[PDB]
Design a protein around this ligand. Sequence first.
Ligand SMILES: [Zn+2]
Ligand SMILES: [Zn+2]
Ligand SMILES: [Zn+2]
Length: 572
Amino acid sequence: AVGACVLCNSQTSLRCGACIRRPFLCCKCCYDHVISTSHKLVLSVNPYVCNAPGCDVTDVTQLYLGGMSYYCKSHKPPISFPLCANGQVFGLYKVTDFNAIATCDWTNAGDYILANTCTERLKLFAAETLKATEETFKLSYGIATVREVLSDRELHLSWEVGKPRPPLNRNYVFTGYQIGEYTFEKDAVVYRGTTTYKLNVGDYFVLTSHTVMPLSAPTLVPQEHYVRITGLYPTLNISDEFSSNVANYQKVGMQKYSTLQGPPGTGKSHFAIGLALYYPSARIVYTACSHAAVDALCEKALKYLPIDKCSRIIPARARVECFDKFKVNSTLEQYVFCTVNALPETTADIVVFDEISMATNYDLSVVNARLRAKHYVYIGDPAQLPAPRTLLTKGTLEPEYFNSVCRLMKTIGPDMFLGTCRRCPAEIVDTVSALVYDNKLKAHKDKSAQCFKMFYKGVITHDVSSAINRPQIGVVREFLTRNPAWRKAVFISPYNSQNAVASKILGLPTQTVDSSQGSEYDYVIFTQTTETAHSCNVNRFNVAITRAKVGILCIMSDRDLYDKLQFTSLEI
Ligand SMILES: [Zn+2]
Ligand SMILES: [Zn+2]
Ligand SMILES: [Zn+2]
């Protein structure tokens, strides 16, 4: 009931009862909150409400101090002090941006912009509130009950009328009921039970709300710059394979935190595992938001790091199938591969945070709060995709507002830039280099002359809100007959429903652009599907076409992105 002020850090008992994270505000500022905002409830030991029986006045502006207790203008004694006056609110030890964070609903991009252009404690308040707000919204959705089970991987569902029905995708993980997490992919719909169990008629699923914990630690600890490699011990036998990264590996030592912008296929994974071989005594924790991104740093470790000092930290409530080749849940191994949401309380010589574009400031804080370390390494690309902000429906989130790392990368540059794409045909590298990397990204590979674009708007249908374009799938059918080499291509689109249909018609494996991020395939077929803000997002486009090692076919809906593709145009 006693704490410090989440603007100035002055000691107070004054929380805001109105704010969803009951923040401890100082007297001068708790005033400037309640007189600016609809927020009028103030707490301390006991609530600032009128003590007169049957009186409902809780607005601190309408309240007074009468002896030891509080009352309204209708109930105060003659000797009484107004709680709200002299620019302060009476409390123990006796802003715009703080108001906006407290009061906003997180449906606008300007709410996320502010939550990344503010002070560090506000960012934590913001991140807490947002996640808080995110969670409380999940309740508002309608339960889904199994009517009948068609087969092993399909069924039909009955919804609770009144409350809305959330969109069926691989982006909305339900909790079945306690028969493990499930998901839904396009009556006939698919039921993806992460735990193998015979689906019972009557049983229900719910979007379970993992409660928001408060944030102690900042997003970014303060930066520290040294004269020499503090706390680590470098070799000079570092295999030529990692010789390019030595000046940067030394930068990692002569700094507290370091930021690496690596465009697709420029050797992030390689650099991370290569930091262990250069500081080979060092205990390292490898962390990223997703099981896939951690499972990626595991594969690039199996190859170069001794398998005996590697533990894949699995959360005891196991989500989806994971990395096996390591010892499971050995916290104190030299090498620890763990999702941010499963990080144990520990310390380390180096922490590498990978896929930083996908980090929420929450995620940045949780990592700092579970890991005290000599050197923090933040690896990814603000030109790739951020974490989906499910409440955001109005405006676009620019990369300089993804989190504090991305904001740094976009304003004063990253510390270190991997400037050579080794994965992609030069047609792709040349395209994204101009589109999102101010031409600073260079192609190692030659043009493949296997990169094709076709402008074909086709016909957009919608399965609820997810888009389909059958004509664009029909153009890909025609192309596959004339290009049998592409029979092994991964089909990629910005939409699950399109993928659902292309699966059934083409027979190719299927991937949304967002789930393609971090992966690579010889041959990619991309149907843009629609001409929306979603399907024309330059970061999503960037990711989509930089999945390809050898060839890509882009069926485009957007003239601009179509013209920008430095590919051979096909005809039909
Ligand atoms: Zn408030
Ligand atoms: Zn204050
Ligand atoms: Zn009263």
